[PDB]
Design a protein around this ligand. Structure first.
Ligand SMILES: [Mg+2]
Length: 758
RNA sequence: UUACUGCACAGGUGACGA
DNA sequence: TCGTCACCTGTGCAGTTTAAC
């Protein structure tokens, strides 16, 4: 039982001698760092300036001399390590600092991919894909109570289009509307300039510009986005360009797949170990063994949570390890009590798509039969309904209509519904050309708004989806049906949980930031999701309808204390019972907000019960990765020699980085998509230090089960639903806030139990 | 906007301190 | 208002014939 990390032990001195002086104003720090450049490493921390001489020779420094033992205060040498790592790799220039980030000197994958595919072109060599390495010194705990410093290795790819803008024109590339960035970067200077309107020899005209409305073609380049790459490439190769991307995919897997990433990390450690890393000209560090997460010795640093169970009844008898297998054999969790067994669903669609939309609906409601066994039975029999009645609502609109599409949809909805009875849900079919119009004329958001105001949740769909070939459609219809059922108030499934306390509430907060363009300043909105422990099951609670970032800490505390009060009345807690409240977000809460939340919650429930509270952040973009060298992977497809998820830790592996932090593996080989899929990154689960409930292994596993609770998809989500649902709610309510005639009035009435945000 | 997954680019932002 | 450590957010494109047996 061992999981290998992407990091190496750093052997450091037991101790280092430093000169300290009080420096209450941190504004003086930058000038002093410049004054002692080259001779002293300088560092501010908690009101005092620390001075570590790294080269003999003045200037000199006042203050108290002090011994800083590395085992007690490893922040000092961790920081010096940032700069020292750069100094030890003089020939690899920093493209970013702390963490030291640099490029491979000779690797360039566009060229290697062209050669291997059999492609060529004069401008190709101006398109570059260069491996990118970062070295992050991090404090970790090899066992509880003892800290050390490791250096963790991560790899990405720099995408850059260095081609002059003049050239791309004369090859046929339409630069109209493409984003453009500076070539020369200056500290404190933005890179994005704006969009491209037209080119007049010397300079290019900008719209949606950040500042300057004009730039010299020599001072600007296309941003190295996938969009710009694909736009330029296919306009010089297609339909051969897909062969390039394939070949590029192949090249990248040579650095990103499990075995290749482990080998790249190994070679990085070997290169870094070959000489001591001077922290001072008489003081050396040394890169050592690859860090491991094991249970060898006095270390208890790796466990494997049990497989999540999908449960489809309240006794626990009907369960499965996959959502779809279990749903297809048992039907939904709430089948015995689901009230509306004959839903009427409004279908809003451009009239010119009538025949394609009828094909889609037949497949949805009545199934695709056993040639497409992913969706044979159809929505009605899948969910145990008696039938579905469609209320067909054609709309006289064409894809070329980019200004009046939304008014046409909404007028047709108004006229159809006025003459009909109540409908319980709606399906809205969208032209691809309309899906991403600005919200003032986007039919997705206007039909969503109109129908949610009226208390009618909608499942929308774009025409390319409606036209998927059947082998793909069957999977689309699994997800479509799960979300639609939940939108009709259904509960498709739960996940197992054995209650060990009398009640447990989990609340999540998610963020959305909305703007009409990148130029425009983004405005923030928030959502709140709640999950309750039931008898053997986690149950989804009610959801926020208000969404302003201002006062979000008050909203968390109001939602928790209101929920605790209703939970106490409903369940009638006994003297001595224990109640647990967990908070989830992608950022940590302020200590002051934790204290406010704890205080109010503690007073609301009172002294008759014991309160346990934990505040948890879930991170996706950290420098840690896990390698399971015992995992050989699975066939890329039945019978193939290629494999996928080689070295991928199993789903539910939990590794201890420190007392407050766990690494959670979510994407197992079974879930990994393709042979070239990179080695996955685990989630980093961090407990807020002021939490009164301290078991972060338990909280990591809880977050695991909540990825399996998403009714957007048959497959688990990338983050627990407490955060994911809140992000979807924040985005939708934030966009709706600016739609004329929107009202939230039905979100707690007709839609109180509808998962209308999926 | 059926989704999951991956990646890229851009924008910056959060928490802790004095 | 700054030092310090950290990584979050939006947008777009592509895929085992992607879709946990
Ligand atoms: Mg949805």
């Amino acid at each position: 039982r061992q999981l290998v990390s992407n990091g190496f032990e750093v052997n450091l001195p037991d101790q280092v001698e430093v000169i300290v002086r009080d420096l209450p104003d941190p504004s003086k720090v930058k000038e002093e760092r410049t004054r002692l450049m080259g001779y002293w490493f300088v560092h501010w921390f908690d009101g005092k300036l620390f001075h570590l001489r790294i080269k003999a020779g003045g200037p000199n420094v006042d203050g108290e001399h002090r011994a800083i033992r590395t085992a007690e205060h490893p922040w000092l040498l961790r920081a010096r390590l940032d700069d020292a790592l750069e100094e030890a790799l003089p020939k690899y220039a920093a493209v970013k600092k702390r963490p030291f980030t640099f490029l491979a000197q000779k690797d360039e994958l566009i060229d290697a991919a062209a050669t291997a595919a059999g492609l060529s072109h004069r401008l190709l060599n101006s398109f570059k894909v260069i491996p990118r390495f970062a070295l992050s010194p991090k404090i970790y705990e090899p066992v509880d109570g003892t800290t050390r410093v490791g250096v963790f290795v991560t790899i990405g790819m720099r995408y850059d289009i260095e081609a002059s803008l003049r050239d791309l024109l004369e090859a046929g590339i339409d630069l109209r509307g493409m984003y453009v960035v500076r070539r020369k970067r200056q500290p404190g200077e933005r890179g994005l300039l704006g969009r491209v309107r037209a080119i007049s020899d010397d300079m290019v005209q900008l719209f949606e510009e950040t500042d300057l409305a004009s730039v010299n073609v020599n001072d600007a380049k296309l941003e190295g986005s996938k969009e710009n790459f694909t736009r330029c490439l296919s306009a010089l190769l297609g339909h051969n360009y897909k062969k390039l991307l394939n070949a590029l995919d192949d090249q990248e897997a040579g650095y990103r797949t499990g075995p290749r990433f482990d080998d790249a990390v190994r070679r990085m450690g070997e290169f870094l170990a070959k000489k001591p890393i001077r922290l001072a000209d008489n003081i050396n560090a040394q890169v050592g063994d690859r860090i491991v997460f094991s249970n060898e010795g006095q270390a208890r640093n790796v466990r494997l949570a049990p497989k999540v169970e999908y449960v489809f009844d309240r006794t626990g008898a009907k369960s499965a390890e996959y959502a779809w297998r279990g749903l297809s054999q048992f039907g939904p969790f709430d089948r015995p009590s689901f009230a509306n067994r004959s839903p009427r669903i409004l279908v809003v669609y451009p009239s010119s798509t009538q025949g394609k939309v009828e094909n889609f609906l037949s497949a949805f409601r009545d199934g695709m039969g056993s040639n497409y066994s992913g969706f044979s039975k159809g929505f009605v029999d899948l969910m145990g309904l008696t039938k579905v009645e469609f209320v067909m609502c054609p709309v006289e609109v064409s894809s070329a209509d980019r200004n009046g599409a939304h008014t046409k949809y909404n007028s047709a909805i108004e006229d159809k519904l006025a003459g009909a009875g109540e409908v319980h849900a709606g399906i809205v079919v969208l032209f691809e050309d309309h899906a991403r119009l600005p919200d003032d004329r986007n039919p997705y958001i206007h039909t969503k708004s109109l129908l949610l105001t009226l208390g009618v949740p909608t499942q929308q769909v774009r025409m390319p989806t409606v036209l998927l070939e059947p082998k793909s459609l069957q999977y689309t219809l699994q997800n479509f049906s799960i979300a639609t059922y939940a939108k009709l108030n259904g509960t498709p499934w739960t996940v197992n949980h054995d209650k060990a306390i009398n009640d447990e509430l989990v609340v999540g907060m998610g963020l959305a930031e909305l703007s009409g363009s990148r130029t425009e300043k983004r405005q923030r909105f928030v959502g709140i999701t709640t999950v309750f422990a039931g008898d053997g099951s986690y149950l989804l609670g009610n959801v926020s309808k208000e969404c302003e970032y201002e006062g979000y800490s008050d909203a968390i505390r109001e939602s928790m204390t209101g929920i605790l009060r209703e939970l106490k009345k409903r369940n009638n807690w006994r003297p001595g019972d224990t109640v647990r409240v967990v908070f989830h977000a992608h950022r940590p809460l302020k200590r002051v907000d934790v204290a406010s939340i704890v205080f109010e919650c503690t007073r609301e429930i009172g002294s008759d019960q014991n309160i346990q509270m934990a505040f948890v952040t879930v991170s996706h973009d950290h420098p840690f990765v896990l390698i399971d060298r015992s995992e050989r992977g699975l066939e890329a497809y039945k019978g193939s020699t290629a494999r996928k998820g080689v070295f991928a830790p199993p789903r539910g592996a939990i590794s201890r980085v420190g007392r407050l932090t766990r690494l959670l593996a979510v994407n197992s080989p079974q879930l990994i998509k393709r042979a070239n899929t990179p080695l996955p990154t685990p989630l980093l689960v961090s407990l807020h230090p002021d939490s009164t409930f301290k078991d972060v292994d338990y909280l990591a596993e809880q977050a695991l089960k909540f990825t399996s609770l998403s009714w957007r998809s048959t497959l688990p989500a990338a983050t627990p639903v407490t955060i994911f649902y809140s992000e979807r709610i924040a985005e939708l309510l934030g966009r709706l806030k600016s739609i004329p005639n929107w009202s939230s009035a039905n979100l707690n009435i007709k839609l109180k139990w509808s998962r209308w945000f999926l």
